[PDB]
RNA sequence: UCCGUGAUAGUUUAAUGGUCAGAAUGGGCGCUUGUCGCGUGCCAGAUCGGGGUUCAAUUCCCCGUCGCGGAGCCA
RNA sequence: AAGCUCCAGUUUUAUGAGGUAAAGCGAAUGAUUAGAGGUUCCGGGGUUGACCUAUUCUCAAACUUUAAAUAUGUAAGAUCCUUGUUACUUAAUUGAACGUGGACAUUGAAGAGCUUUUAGUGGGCCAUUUUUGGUAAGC
RNA sequence: GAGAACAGAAAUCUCCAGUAGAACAAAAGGGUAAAAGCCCCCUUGAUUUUGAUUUUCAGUGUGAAUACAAACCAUGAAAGU
RNA sequence: GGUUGCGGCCAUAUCUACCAGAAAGCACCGUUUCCCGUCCGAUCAACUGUGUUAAGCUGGUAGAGCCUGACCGAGUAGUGUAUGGGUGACCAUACGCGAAACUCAGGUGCUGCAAUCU
């Protein structure tokens, strides 16, 4: 038969999480929402730039609109735990993307936090899970660029049902 | 779903024409290439990494490649598999591994060969240390170029480290000393330049120092044991072989391969397909396979 | 008076290559090196950028002069006026293409050579030509003065 | 509208033009529409298919295009009132006019300076009507042969290149066309 | 008709470096004042229609519509 | 002209190229249009289901690229070996290709090469074919 | 296209699908996908000398270009460029 | 039956269901302490194997795309060459040539060298 089993391979991953705010200086500050994002994700973020424009004031293509960080791994992981524990649920499929992919919004000061040592803060910023199998690779590591079938595709059955499984 | 190229297609199927299957199977870019070639000195190709991706992690390769009218055509090579066969139990995957194999690849080019030699001038370069590559020639080198592929220049990365092991080899090879995985970093001794460090070979001798469970087989004075086996004249290889046995053979392959489609036409599995389809039709009628097939009646 | 003469006007078609020559060339056409006397066509590729000649030269052939580093060094005939003079062209080797038509040619006459050695050994196939051949000649053979007998009606006082 | 014959226009000038970026400003397509009648109907349901077809190589102009199936469609309308059967124009009109737009008198005469020069201002479309094509594609039936034949007989003195009126084969007639289900 | 020259709030006209638009009046808003008005605080544009280029067009091209000036020969 | 000196063409082969008709890309007037997923607004009723935009498979001819152009004029293009000695670019390294020195063996017909000096322009015209402007014209 | 409160201009970031329709200062058209495009570093060879030759122009200059060799360095693993 | 190095012809190999190089001739995963990528080992740069065939390369199998041909369209459109007819424009004629669809067919690759196999 075609070939129904148990395997971990055909199992799910976290991929990334990126956490990243879209503010737009001066209104609160030049990047200093970034203290806010480092004590939230433990890392440093990197500056985010525009190209884009616009349009309103942002006319200056190269500046820092914005900030970012991209977590992966077990500082993934961590950031999930307190993430997901605000946002209570059981929340709904909607958010949830075609991709297998999820994303909320929410201020930084949530999470278990000093709200003291920030200097200033922001809602916000996409905390954004993207969720892919293994053999995902392929399309990201360059050479032998290939593209993810549509098996290999993740679905909103599969994410749900993974991160609905754990610390939900 | 998408195709979405069915549709725009005729420009969607330009985008094989530009490469072959080198591009789509994704290792060999042309102008990385380009660059060797026009040049009449051969590529020494050493695939590290990405091959397709026939290595690594597990092996590495070293050949060196010339072009002729036919195609390119393989002068000689060296596996790290047939590297035992000398005599080393260790790791495949190291940097010990990548120059002692590189050596291989470039005693197999000499080989003083082709009734034609290369014995004077200086072979053997031993297995060393070198401290600066000396040759004989100094600024000369050639018959052998540096093709990395994908593959990157970092110093200390190894795709370099077999370059290494060709110029102590007796191929004589185009380098810079502050680029290379340098002579302590095969373990060997080491260091000028504006870049460092003075261990990597014997980076896993600093790794397993660092307790912790690996593999057997002991400590940093293995790698002295059999890397001094290495230095060692001893060339000419091999093997031979049982051969094959009989006929086209083997029991995936043949499901895997056959009569309808042959190279060849499969004119039996389209037919039976459909006459088939064609009996499917019959009975219910809508669509088709694809999922058009009406009219207005 | 008006416009332009031009390098680049007219170039439309001829720069132009099929659906299927486009993307890019590959450089074992880069690669090629010829000897001198070879048959090359001259056609630019449109999918290299630089070593092109002047477009007005290409769909004609030459013999490979000499060569001076990577390009080469091609003489072709041009045509019109008075006392015209044979151009050395310097173009590339991606440009620079065989020609089949006499390497057949080279081939056919010299296997056909091969069949009359034995033939005018033990054979009579033909036998006028054997009379001038055996007579005739060195030149040695191969030189630079059969040249202008050749460039000389390339001029021609008819056309005029 | 103007005058000027179509002396002027007929016979095959020009490389064309009618090019879009060579020509800002060209006077109007004139035809009310292509399609005309029962717009909301298959070709199939109709037994007949007429044709009106060239004997000549010509530019129609724009307004005569429009004059002479106008004329067509008064006489199809007013027989066989306002739901009745089917009609396509064959040939739109684009191609475009140059014409130099009555100088002055300033003893200025051409004041340009001498000229008449390129860049000719336009006076609007024509279409390209070459010999044995077919100008109107009409779909009726039987017992309104008649009908489209006077008024394709109305038409006909509302454009200058001479043609004829035909019964049309394509693929099949109307029959060969209809057995496969 | 050619070649020149323009047009911005109810109206007349300032203005730019490609990222930012005004004044003055007229009006609508109160207070003055017996009451209106003058005065004195307050207020508010699809930059002619049009398509295009660009990162971003009131600003840079291309056309028309209108209002202007300047030509106009030897009959 | 005056002299000097004793090779030219063409089918056939091969190359790439005008072009202009119906597809592809880009532009696209510009209809007709069934089927059919989705915009975005309000607005009435018992998720459904009237209302405008609009993918998507899908249909009449034009025009500038490109296939394959089809064409047709074109339109250039028609000695070998061995021996020794020298060179050469390119690892004290691999090769060819140079040059020499020596030996060996191979349908056409004067349409024709070069030089000195010389003259009249340095304002054309018509037709045929292919045009481009011009309503046209013994333009 | 989807996905993310707020945002419309909304960059932003994310995922998929994506072969020359993008980018390549500037006309036109052509041309290219580990690219000649995009990024990161490092840098000055936008050096001096001579220029075979073509375009100029079929023989006629400036100019331009395509190739060198000498002289000199760069980056680069180096070939090379 | 050939997987794969290096290629060449480079639209006969673009795209979308699913079977196979594999008990010591892969890919993956795991050490990601580190030379190394950073903004995260993801990218990459390195050291290695619990074992797993799911993807990967490529082989097995189906359509729109496409080359190549056969079949009509059948020498048709067009065309240099010589010339008759038409009021004009336009047409034909002999001399040599000859595109568009149609349907059917072949092919979801080819070819060469080596790492050379159970």
Known sequence: MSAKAQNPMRDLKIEKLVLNISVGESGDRLTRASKVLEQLSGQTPVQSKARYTVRTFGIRRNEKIAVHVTVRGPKAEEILERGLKVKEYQLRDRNFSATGNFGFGIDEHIDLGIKYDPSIGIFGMDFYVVMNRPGARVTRRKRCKGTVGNSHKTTKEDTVSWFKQKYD | MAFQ???????????????????????????????????????????????????????????????????????????????????????????????????????????????????????????????????????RPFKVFLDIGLQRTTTGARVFGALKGASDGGLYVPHSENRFPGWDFETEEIDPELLRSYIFGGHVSQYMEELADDDEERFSELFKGYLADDIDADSLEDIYTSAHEAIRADPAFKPTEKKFTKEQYAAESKKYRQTKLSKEERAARVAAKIAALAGQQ | MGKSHGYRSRTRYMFQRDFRKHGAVHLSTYLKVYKVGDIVDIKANGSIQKGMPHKFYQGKTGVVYNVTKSSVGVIINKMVGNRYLEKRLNLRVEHIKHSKCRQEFLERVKANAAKRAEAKAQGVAVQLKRQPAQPRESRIVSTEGNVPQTLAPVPYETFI | MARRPARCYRYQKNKPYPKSRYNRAVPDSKIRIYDLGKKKATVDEFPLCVHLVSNELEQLSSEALEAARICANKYMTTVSGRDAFHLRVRVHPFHVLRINKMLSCAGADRLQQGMRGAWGKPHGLAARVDIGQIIFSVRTKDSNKDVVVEGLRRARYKFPGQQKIILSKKWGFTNLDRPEY
Do not use: M
């Open chain 2, 5 to 139: 190229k069915d549709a725009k297609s005729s420009a969607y199927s330009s985008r094989f024409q530009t490469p072959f299957r080198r591009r789509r199977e994704g290792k060999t870019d042309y102008y990385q290439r380009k660059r060797l070639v026009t040049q009449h000195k051969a590529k020494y190709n050493t695939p590290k990494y990405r091959l397709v991706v026939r290595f690594t992690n597990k092996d590495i390769i070293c050949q060196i490649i010339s072009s002729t009218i036919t195609g390119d055509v393989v002068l000689a090579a060296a596996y790290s598999h047939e590297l035992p066969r000398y005599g080393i139990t260790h790791g495949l995957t190291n940097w010990a591994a990548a120059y002692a194999t590189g050596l291989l690849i470039a005693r197999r080019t000499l080989q003083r060969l082709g009734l034609d030699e290369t014995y004077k001038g200086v072979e053997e370069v031993e297995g060393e240390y070198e401290l600066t590559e000396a040759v004989e020639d100094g600024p």
